[PDB]
Amino acid sequence: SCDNCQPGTFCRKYNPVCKSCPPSTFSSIGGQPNCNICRVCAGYFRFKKFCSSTHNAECECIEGFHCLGPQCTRCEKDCRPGQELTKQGCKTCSLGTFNDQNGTGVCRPWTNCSLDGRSVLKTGTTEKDVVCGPL
Template identity: 50%
Template sequence: MCRQCEGLFQYSKRCSSTSDAECTCKEGYRCGGDGCTFCIRSCGVGQESTRSGCQACRYGTFNDQPNGSCKNWTMCSGNQVLEPGTPAKDVICKDASVNFTSVTTVPTTSLEIPFSITVPGKDVQTDTIRISLAVAGLSCIVFLLPLCICFSVWQKKKLHAVFKKMHTLEQSVQEDDACSCHFPEEEQGEYQNPGKSTELRDLLMN
């Protein structure tokens, strides 16, 4: 038995001995389900389909495609809105990177070389320079290391000699101070024994 296209349906292909009839929806409606089993009202731009039919997109949403669904407007950063949104159109934001000053540009052409130029022996020269620098660096290290060691040893010996000399000088100063301490006692003894001093002077005069 062939399918009957009635009501909101209309024939898109008639029934034949080899195939069944195919139905489509009348103008203002669109097919729903597999094989167009039912028809729903077609909704235009700025609308979306609901159970009760087509309904306009609520504030803050839009639909720019027929039989589409409503989507939220784009949120512009810092409320930089260039054009407000409508049920059929999204919000257009200001682009800070856009410069409206017209600039005249002169087209330039660049010369492209379809082949690469290689310099013979360039890699060999580079390797030779690197090896020479490495050898020079190692030579400096080998030469400077013994000098640093010798200088350190010489510095220690010099400091030891200076400390030894200072110690000897300090001992000699202490001995001089010890000797100088006896002279006042001798002078004091002379003043305490004036008789002995007089006798000694008489003996020397005779």
């Protein structure tokens, strides 16, 4: 009987009624005995999308932070030089690659100085490219 109810309602099998979900509460599937609690977005989080009767609120991260996980359940500090922002958060550049930008950019590979005739003056790290000699 309660299976005839649609999303944004709750319904108890002993007394079938498709009652609207109360405030700050939702249900994406209809006709369950209770509605789920709305997620509040505060502190490091802000609302991307407000809660409605049929779907949860979605959170976003404040300035200087980015979302971590599929439901943005954690914020992570924006990455430092020597790191790139992947879809799974900040990953340190692997051996042979670098990034010199703060809070942006991607891990590029080191300049091979011997593509020209040039020699290496300075070795490479995760934050600095190798420096080559004279052309």
